[model samples]
Target: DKELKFLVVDAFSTMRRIVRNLLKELGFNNVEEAEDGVDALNKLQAGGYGFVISDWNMPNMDGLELLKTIRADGAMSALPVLMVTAEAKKENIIAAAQAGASGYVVKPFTAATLEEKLNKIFEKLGM
Candidate 1:
């Protein structure tokens, strides 16, 4: 489990801290944070990231753009990506779905929500 590095991408540091805390509670100590999609991509390229939790709202490459990039990458195309964002518009959901988002969760969610999503993605990927 420690080898499964997680990248949490959000514009706000507080959000990143909250996600990182929840991830720790879930026994995911190998967690890292990124301020935006650009930073996230950099970390992803550095490699060893098994999962991604990203926000939809960001400057200089939003979650959508990042998702597209991940999907296009031959190396990480099948990597699970969970969208944890406040943007709950149907349009946003459709776009994320179209981009092959592995899972989606609204903001202000409970720890159980994150756990379930993570488990479900893990199950789907046969991890």
Candidate 2:
């Protein structure tokens, strides 16, 4: 767990901070923040990111696009991306899943919910 690094991306600074705090509380201290998908992709390209938690809507690039981009990249093709967004529409969720998101989490969720999703993803990935 200590070796794994998480990237939390959101257009809103407050959301990023909240996710970071939640991850920290969950025993994940190696967490980073990005304001949007573009910044996330830049950091991802630098390598060493094990997981991603991103918002659905943002300027420059959105969570779906970021998920697809990561999937398309050979080096990071299997990276786990958990979409954390307020877009609760079925279509949005479907689109994200189709685009290779590891998991989808609705906004205004609790720390326990995040932990559950993270654990599920890690279990599925055998990590």
Candidate 3:
């Protein structure tokens, strides 16, 4: 469990720090940060990422596009992606779900909520 590596992707460095800190508090200390979806994808292709936590709006590529790319890739199709964004609209949620996101989380979230979502995803993955 402690060996699982997480990638936290967001445009804002502050948000990335917050998520990293939250993950650390949740006992997931092996967390890495990516400024955008493109960067995250580059890192992912390099290997060793077990989980992804990404924001919807980004500079180069958005989280939805990233999710779609990951799902389409044969090697990483089963990779778990958790969308963490401020896009709280029903349509946004539906779109993410349709894109094969493993889970969804709204911004301004508590650590408990983050932990719960992580646990739920891990449980489904049998991790």
Model 2 C-alpha lDDT versus the unseen true structure: 0.88
Model 2 lDDT per residue over 44-110, tens place: 8999899988888888787788889989999999999999877588888888878888988888998
Q: Candidate 2, after superposition: displacement of residue 120 in Å?
A: 1.0
Clashes (backbone N, CA, C under 3 Å), per candidate, total: 0, 0, 0
Residue-wise lDDT of candidate 3 within 4-103, one digit each (tens)? 8999999999999999898888888999999987788889998889898999889879889999999998878888999987758899999999999999
**Across residues 1-127, which tens digit of lDDT does each residue of candidate 1 receive?**
6558999999999999999999888888999899998888888887888999998878889888999999999988988999977758898899899999998999898789999888898889899
For each candidate in turn, the TM-score is 0.94, 0.95, 0.95
How do these models rank on TM-score, best leading? 3, 2, 1
RMSDs, each prediction?
1.2, 1.1, 1.0
Q: lDDT, candidate 2, residue 108?
A: 95
Error of 1 at 17 (Å): 0.2
